[model samples]
Target: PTKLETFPLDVLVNTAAEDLPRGVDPSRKENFLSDEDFKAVFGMTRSAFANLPLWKQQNLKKEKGLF
Candidate 1:
């Protein structure tokens, strides 16, 4: 079999946010929020997310306020 494909979804999102058309560097501003913090609030563990199926991955990709 060919090598499996890997999607670095989290990293890609961060990169795209950095390269937004409006020069928006969203991760630089410290609000009362952080992605890590929000993930914590949702009781989401990195390991669990990484292991989720493709459908779950798409749902996670749409998570709001996720810059």
Candidate 2:
């Protein structure tokens, strides 16, 4: 056996890189959020935010009081 974990990976997912984890609730999903959503919440455009490290992203989110 090659440590078969393929099927699980297809459904359960893995250590996701998504900052919001499983999306910000079901209704307001981080998965679908775009540049506008970032500005709408964090007041930072996604273009600029994309250049920033996660650390700065955290700070920005904190500063804006993300909903």
Candidate 3:
């Protein structure tokens, strides 16, 4: 499993946003109005995102064609 600390914050943030659906996923409910503000919404911060299981990370990456 890759350590969460190993991935760049940009990658994590972008990937998360990519996986989130507009008008459905709260993280992007407002279409991410601003990257800075989006990070703090509904515990979408890097630290919180990093807490997801390795499988979840891989799944999200795959969903975005990143894996």
Candidate 4:
């Protein structure tokens, strides 16, 4: 049972911050859910994703055009 399951989508969106890398253009800002928030919302293990090979990680981002 996750809080996200009960919470409104707008509440989650409102809680997300526009935190991004320094010197990066605001236009390039990517919306990110915090590690804790992501796990809670999606009900998945973040460690599994973190354990992926660098190449695999890069390839996934490239394919999705995700930062």
User: What TM-score goes with each of the models?
Assistant: 0.36, 0.35, 0.34, 0.36
lDDT of each: 0.44, 0.42, 0.44, 0.42
Quote model 4's TM-score.
0.36
Model 1, position 7, has a per-residue lDDT of: 27
Q: What is the lDDT of residue 49 in candidate 4?
A: 50
TM-score of structure candidate 1 = 0.36
Pick by lDDT: 1 or 4, better one: 1
Q: Is candidate 1 or candidate 2 better by lDDT?
A: 1
- Which scores greater on TM-score, model 1 or model 3? 1
Please give the lDDT score for candidate 3: 0.44
> What is candidate 1's lDDT per residue for 1-67, written digit by digit as tens?
4432332334334545546434333442212224565365346765575577856655644564343
Extract clashing residue pairs from model 1. Answer: none
- Candidate 3 per-residue lDDT, tens place, 5-57, comes to 22333444565555644333323232333445435333366555567786775
Candidate 2 least-lDDT 10 residues: 4-13
Q: What TM-score number comes out for model 2?
A: 0.35
Which pairs of residues have clashing backbones in candidate 2? none
**Model 2, range 1-67, lDDT digits (tens) per residue?**
2221122211222233353343333222222355455456556565676677877766654554431
After superposition on all C-alphas, the RMSD of every candidate to the true structure, in Å, is 10.5, 11.7, 12.0, 9.3
> Can you give the lDDT of residue 62 in candidate 2?
55
Candidate 4's displacement at residue 13, Å, is: 16
- Ranked by lDDT, top first: 3, 1, 4, 2
